[PDB]
Amino acid sequence: PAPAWTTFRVGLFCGIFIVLNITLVLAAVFKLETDRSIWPLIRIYRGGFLLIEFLFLLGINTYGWRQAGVNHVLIFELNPRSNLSHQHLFEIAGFLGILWCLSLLACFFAPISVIPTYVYPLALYGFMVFFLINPTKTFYYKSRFWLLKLLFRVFTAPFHKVGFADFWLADQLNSLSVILMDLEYMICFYSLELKWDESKGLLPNNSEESGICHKYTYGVRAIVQCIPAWLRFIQCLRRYRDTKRAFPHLVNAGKYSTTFFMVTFAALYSTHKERGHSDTMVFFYLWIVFYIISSCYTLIWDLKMDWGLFDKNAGENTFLREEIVYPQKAYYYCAIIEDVILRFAWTIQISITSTTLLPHSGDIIATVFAPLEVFRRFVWNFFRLENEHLNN
Amino acid sequence: PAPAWTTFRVGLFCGIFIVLNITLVLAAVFKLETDRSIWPLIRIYRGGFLLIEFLFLLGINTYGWRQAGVNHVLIFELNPRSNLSHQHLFEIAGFLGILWCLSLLACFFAPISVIPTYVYPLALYGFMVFFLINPTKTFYYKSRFWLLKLLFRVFTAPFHKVGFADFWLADQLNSLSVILMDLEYMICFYSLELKWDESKGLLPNNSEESGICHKYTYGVRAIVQCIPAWLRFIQCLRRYRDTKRAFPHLVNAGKYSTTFFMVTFAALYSTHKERGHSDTMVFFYLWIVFYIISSCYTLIWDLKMDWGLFDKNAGENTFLREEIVYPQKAYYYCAIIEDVILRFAWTIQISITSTTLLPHSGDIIATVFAPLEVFRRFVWNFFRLENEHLNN
């Protein structure tokens, strides 16, 4: 039984977040001057928005798991006597939303300072990380260090054994590639083009230094995008080498290997089109070919093995598995169809992120389609854990 | 314990109220011009602010009552199957505070509208009164219906039997004469003063006919002040008539008629000042006397019977009673020290809001001195019902 103080905190945070969003929308529509470049602001705050949203739906997921009766503490090897309820996740999400809204509003108005408007985002991300790395024995002194340990163990995956938590968190990271992409963008912007000992902050894009972060002449953007795929590929390879069972781990390695071919081919087509080479169209051709070969194959891995659906022993449960726990079948069907639709959109977003086509529109497309695969992951987790619980 | 939805609603409403208050303060500091008169607006919203503060303090009172272990249900003679915890009062107070802030902000800014400022208070108070008298079976139907029934019982006190709750709310209304005075000010302003078939709203007015609501006319200012005094007076007269006890029911007659004497002398003094007679200062002298015989008499009623301190069997509890249920006597000492200060100020406020003196500064004193008698009565309730429980 959660104390009422937690629920009161949840309500307080939700209300403050709601009004801050409303007033920030009003300030955006009214106070913003239209000539000044605005895109860097969204490219900076998109990561914060994505993380906050993901935390919220993770809380929803754990509440749903607890209500459905799926014993998840044992399969997560979590401590039964010390576990996090959804209310705490809601408080964390609300507090982060409050700080993000305040930071964006302060950047928007900027009454007075020494540096005009480019001081708040760094302090904001610093507050986030200091919350993450808090060494005191407070603020859920169990969850923070546990998450830090899991993150460090994932970051050095090829040496330690891989469990359920390891690959679960790795795949969750696989859907937040926009986080690290925007992080690298902010480093590149703040290190090379931005003059810290300067004023203003509306440098024209006609300048030669402009768009350097947008260009791929260094070639590290593709790598920084495909880190999670590499991590997952090497974890599944290590799992195979440990257990010596070829079929599942090799298929998983293939599914996670298609994406390096994706990004490498997209980058090569990009450099050949900017170089004006005569035969730039063939790499586009095999680009769509790899599109199909990756999408169709991640689809079959998702629907066949992950959820155990479309099985020939379905029986009376047509279009589902013989044994189910969630009573609403329409939720199953909607999840399948939406999963299919957004699977292609996810790799569309990857391609636009790593291709640098349509500078006017590509940023907008990435922005709109970023907060959708996170929703897909949220809905996916339900059925992944129900299947794993039934298998166990 | 209430369902967590209750606490969540309480937190949400409190947070939105805090954020609305702070943004209203910022807008007033920034947007408002100093030259333009603002006093009518604050005189309008004072009543709503006082009511909201009263509801909050009532919630705190009932929480403390339940915690201290006093059997308040029997003493109020309320049904045990339907009682309101502090959280319900908290959510109602937060809701009304939300609409109060929203209406004040709408009056303040008025970005796009047809009627600038002179419809919102009417709509707010109308919705409040409709909420009070909504005949449907929702939104705490029993509490509102019971309160309406007991209000009807109180307003016909000379005919109906008087009880504990009757005189309790009679006293609460006595300390809340400010809302009645402000309501009559609004009524006369809306009927005769304000310019209806015009625009903008408040405009500088220097004519003699302006400020008639600031004037006493003939008696329209004193009588509204002494409505609570007259009501409590006739309640005590009927009580004496039914039980036939001399001491308390006859001293309370002077208790509630001394304020009548004071307001009448205030009216005569203000009229003499308008006439400018030489003998006027004479009525000033007895004024102070008729000031004194009010406050120090009311005081000797409170500490001796209602709270019942200064008992001859005080013993170890210095200047207190021999039996105290509250843990610390520090609250008792604080109450005793604050009662004397706020009682005199209460009488001063009753004098000033009726004598129509100090035109440019008296209203400021009235505004600042309105929201403390509510706090005084909030302090009073604890000890009053505690002593009543001990008497029972």
Side-chain angles (χ1 to χ4, degrees), chain A residues 132-371:
Chain A
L132 184 52
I133 63 189
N134 175 24
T136 69
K137 222 149 198 277
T138 42
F139 299 151
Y140 325 111
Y141 73 95
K142 154 265 196 188
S143 309
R144 286 176 294 109
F145 309 111
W146 172 292
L147 174 63
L148 280 174
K149 140 162 150 31
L150 264 283
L151 191 139
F152 293 142
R153 275 170 32 63
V154 152
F155 204 60
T156 88
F159 313 149
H160 325 251
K161 199 221 291 182
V162 152
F164 195 98
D166 304 88
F167 92 97
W168 187 77
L169 207 158
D171 156 25
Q172 302 291 155
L173 203 40
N174 199 357
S175 285
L176 312 181
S177 69
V178 191
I179 288 284
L180 318 89
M181 172 45 237
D182 303 354
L183 200 185
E184 197 275 340
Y185 176 69
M186 91 175 308
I187 320 316
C188 155
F189 164 102
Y190 141 82
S191 40
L192 329 175
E193 305 73 21
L194 180 76
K195 339 284 183 194
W196 50 304
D197 298 288
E198 207 41 271
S199 312
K200 213 83 68 64
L202 69 105
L203 298 161
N205 288 356
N206 304 3
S207 60
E208 294 184 345
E209 299 185 348
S210 66
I212 282 182
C213 297
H214 259 269
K215 288 179 184 192
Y216 290 173
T217 186
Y218 299 92
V220 84
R221 269 64 56 183
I223 327 164
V224 80
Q225 183 293 349
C226 58
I227 327 174
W230 181 315
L231 319 188
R232 190 58 172 105
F233 174 49
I234 84 165
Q235 302 144 49
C236 56
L237 271 193
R238 164 151 172 77
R239 263 203 83 209
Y240 173 31
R241 194 262 284 177
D242 193 328
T243 181
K244 167 57 173 171
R245 272 282 300 144
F247 147 70
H249 316 99
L250 264 77
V251 177
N252 232 16
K255 183 203 73 52
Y256 288 103
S257 54
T258 82
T259 170
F260 325 84
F261 291 179
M262 226 51 187
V263 201
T264 49
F265 229 68
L268 84 83
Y269 154 100
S270 206
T271 165
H272 259 188
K273 67 145 279 205
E274 57 88 18
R275 218 201 52 188
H277 161 84
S278 50
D279 291 16
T280 179
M281 48 286 278
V282 278
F283 333 103
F284 199 78
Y285 271 71
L286 309 105
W287 177 93
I288 320 105
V289 188
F290 267 115
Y291 193 111
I292 313 162
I293 211 64
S294 196
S295 301
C296 292
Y297 174 54
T298 183
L299 262 293
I300 52 162
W301 197 239
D302 253 12
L303 282 313
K304 175 33 171 63
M305 201 59 41
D306 256 341
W307 294 345
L309 293 163
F310 278 179
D311 85 283
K312 197 53 78 195
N313 169 10
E316 79 209 43
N317 294 328
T318 55
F319 284 179
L320 318 92
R321 144 161 161 170
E322 190 75 80
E323 182 37 35
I324 77 169
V325 296
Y326 312 116
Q328 46 293 24
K329 308 172 72 176
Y331 207 18
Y332 291 93
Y333 308 132
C334 286
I336 315 145
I337 53 154
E338 79 92 13
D339 195 310
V340 196
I341 319 148
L342 289 154
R343 278 266 172 242
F344 333 101
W346 162 57
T347 201
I348 289 160
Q349 163 207 282
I350 299 186
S351 47
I352 321 303
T353 306
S354 311
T355 306
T356 74
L357 287 173
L358 309 187
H360 177 211
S361 178
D363 36 358
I364 313 306
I365 314 301
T367 278
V368 278
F369 295 110

Side-chain angles (χ1 to χ4, degrees), chain B residues 205-305:
Chain B
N205 290 319
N206 294 359
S207 61
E208 292 187 346
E209 296 185 347
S210 66
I212 276 181
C213 294
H214 279 156
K215 290 177 184 190
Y216 30 65
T217 77
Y218 309 111
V220 314
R221 174 83 34 82
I223 187 43
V224 277
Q225 198 77 174
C226 35
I227 295 164
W230 182 7
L231 189 182
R232 198 39 179 127
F233 193 40
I234 40 184
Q235 288 219 24
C236 208
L237 301 183
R238 195 169 178 295
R239 184 131 196 268
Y240 165 62
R241 202 209 93 211
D242 48 58
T243 167
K244 314 311 292 170
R245 269 286 265 139
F247 165 49
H249 312 117
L250 294 161
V251 290
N252 289 26
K255 175 53 189 335
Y256 294 115
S257 46
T258 167
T259 167
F260 219 142
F261 283 148
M262 198 277 257
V263 282
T264 51
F265 274 154
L268 286 286
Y269 192 95
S270 206
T271 325
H272 257 295
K273 285 316 299 175
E274 159 283 348
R275 191 215 329 275
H277 202 279
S278 54
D279 280 1
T280 300
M281 104 303 295
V282 166
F283 333 118
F284 165 110
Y285 294 133
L286 51 75
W287 160 287
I288 302 171
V289 202
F290 266 86
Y291 179 111
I292 315 321
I293 41 155
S294 193
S295 46
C296 34
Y297 169 110
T298 286
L299 265 153
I300 50 162
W301 195 217
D302 265 349
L303 294 318
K304 187 54 173 305
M305 192 305 297

Side-chain angles (χ1 to χ4, degrees), chain A residues 4 7-8 10-12 14-16 19-20, chain B residues 4 7-8 10-12 14-16 19-20:
Chain A
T7 318
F8 165 73
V10 166
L12 160 64
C14 164
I16 288 178
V19 154
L20 261 284
Chain B
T7 314
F8 170 69
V10 160
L12 188 140
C14 182
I16 307 189
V19 85
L20 258 299

Side-chain angles (χ1 to χ4, degrees), chain B residues 5-66:
Chain B
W5 283 106
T6 307
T7 314
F8 170 69
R9 292 182 269 216
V10 160
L12 188 140
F13 289 137
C14 182
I16 307 189
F17 185 38
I18 297 284
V19 85
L20 258 299
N21 227 28
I22 178 63
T23 189
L24 184 144
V25 166
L26 271 283
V29 174
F30 225 130
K31 158 79 147 284
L32 193 65
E33 80 207 60
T34 283
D35 314 328
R36 163 60 37 76
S37 188
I38 179 154
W39 322 91
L41 287 75
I42 49 191
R43 303 201 71 80
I44 299 158
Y45 298 129
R46 199 168 63 204
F49 181 46
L50 286 149
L51 211 53
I52 293 153
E53 174 184 10
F54 175 77
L55 275 159
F56 193 80
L57 310 192
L58 242 186
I60 276 297
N61 254 308
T62 174
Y63 173 23
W65 263 338
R66 192 90 63 169

Side-chain angles (χ1 to χ4, degrees), chain B residues 103-210:
Chain B
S103 178
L104 189 174
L105 225 48
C107 273
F108 205 84
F109 261 24
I112 310 175
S113 210
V114 191
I115 278 306
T117 77
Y118 48 103
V119 47
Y120 301 120
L122 308 148
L124 162 56
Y125 292 146
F127 170 14
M128 177 30 202
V129 69
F130 164 41
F131 195 13
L132 181 43
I133 62 139
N134 165 37
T136 70
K137 206 192 314 307
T138 43
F139 304 149
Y140 315 106
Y141 77 70
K142 157 261 164 177
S143 280
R144 311 165 305 146
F145 287 170
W146 164 96
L147 169 75
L148 268 162
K149 173 205 303 197
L150 164 156
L151 267 188
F152 176 56
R153 204 141 291 181
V154 158
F155 263 49
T156 87
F159 317 137
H160 282 126
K161 188 146 100 172
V162 304
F164 189 90
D166 313 328
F167 92 91
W168 182 85
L169 165 46
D171 290 311
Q172 312 290 23
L173 199 31
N174 175 32
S175 286
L176 296 178
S177 325
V178 292
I179 40 184
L180 321 183
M181 154 48 219
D182 279 272
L183 163 151
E184 295 289 337
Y185 172 80
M186 178 189 285
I187 277 304
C188 58
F189 180 37
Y190 141 82
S191 56
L192 164 154
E193 290 177 321
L194 62 82
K195 328 295 165 299
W196 164 352
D197 308 312
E198 295 63 44
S199 289
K200 180 61 182 175
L202 186 63
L203 277 177
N205 290 319
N206 294 359
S207 61
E208 292 187 346
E209 296 185 347
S210 66

Side-chain angles (χ1 to χ4, degrees), chain B residues 346-357:
Chain B
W346 169 61
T347 86
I348 307 164
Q349 173 255 284
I350 298 197
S351 68
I352 314 168
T353 81
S354 34
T355 166
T356 77
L357 270 168

